[PDB]
Amino acid sequence: LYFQGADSCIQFTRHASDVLLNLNRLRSRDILTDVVIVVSREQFRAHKTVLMACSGLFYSIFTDQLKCNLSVINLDPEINPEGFCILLDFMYTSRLNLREGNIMAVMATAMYLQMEHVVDTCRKFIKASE
Numbered sequence: 001l002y003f004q005g006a007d008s009c010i011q012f013t014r015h016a017s018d019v020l021l022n023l024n025r026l027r028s029r030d031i032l033t034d035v036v037i038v039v040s041r042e043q044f045r046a047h048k049t050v051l052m053a054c055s056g057l058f059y060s061i062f063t064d065q066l067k068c069n070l071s072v073i074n075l076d077p078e079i080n081p082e083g084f085c086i087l088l089d090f091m092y093t094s095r096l097n098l099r100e101g102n103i104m105a106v107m108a109t110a111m112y113l114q115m116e117h118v119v120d121t122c123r124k125f126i127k128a129s130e
């Protein structure tokens with residue numbers, strides 16, 4: 001549906017999440033993906049704009065006039081690829097699959113990627129688990 005928003009424009013409730021869903025479908029089909037992220041020898045295709053929109057690190061990389069033309073970006077080879085995969089999934093879905101078994105790897109990776117709200121959330125869940 002839609003609603004009358006604060007600015008008095010018509011606002012579409014599901015639009016942002018539909019856009020994100022459609023970008024994730026493109027990613028699944030490898031449509032218009034323009035970068036490969038390499039972690040611990042594993043490769044992940046993505047759209048630079050989505051990466052930038054979610055991560056301070058990717059924002060810095062792709063606004064650099066030298067690095068914005070790289071179509072392959074290697075990350076720290078100590079990054080847990082599953083940690084990366086979970087965060088990439090989050091970027092494209094809004095859903096973060098946080099578990100006791102993975103939380104430390106996810107949090108370290110989010111710190112490295114400068115994903116501040118994810119780092120905060122990871123912090124709170126650890127606080128509670130201790």
Ligand SMILES: O=C1Cc2cc(Nc3ncncc3Cl)ccc2N1
Pocket residue numbers: 022023025026
């Ligand atoms: O009304 C509409 C809005 C709209 C968006 C799209 N786009 C996509 N659809 C499915 N998978 C990926 C993408 Cl990017 C296609 C048809 C229509 N029709």
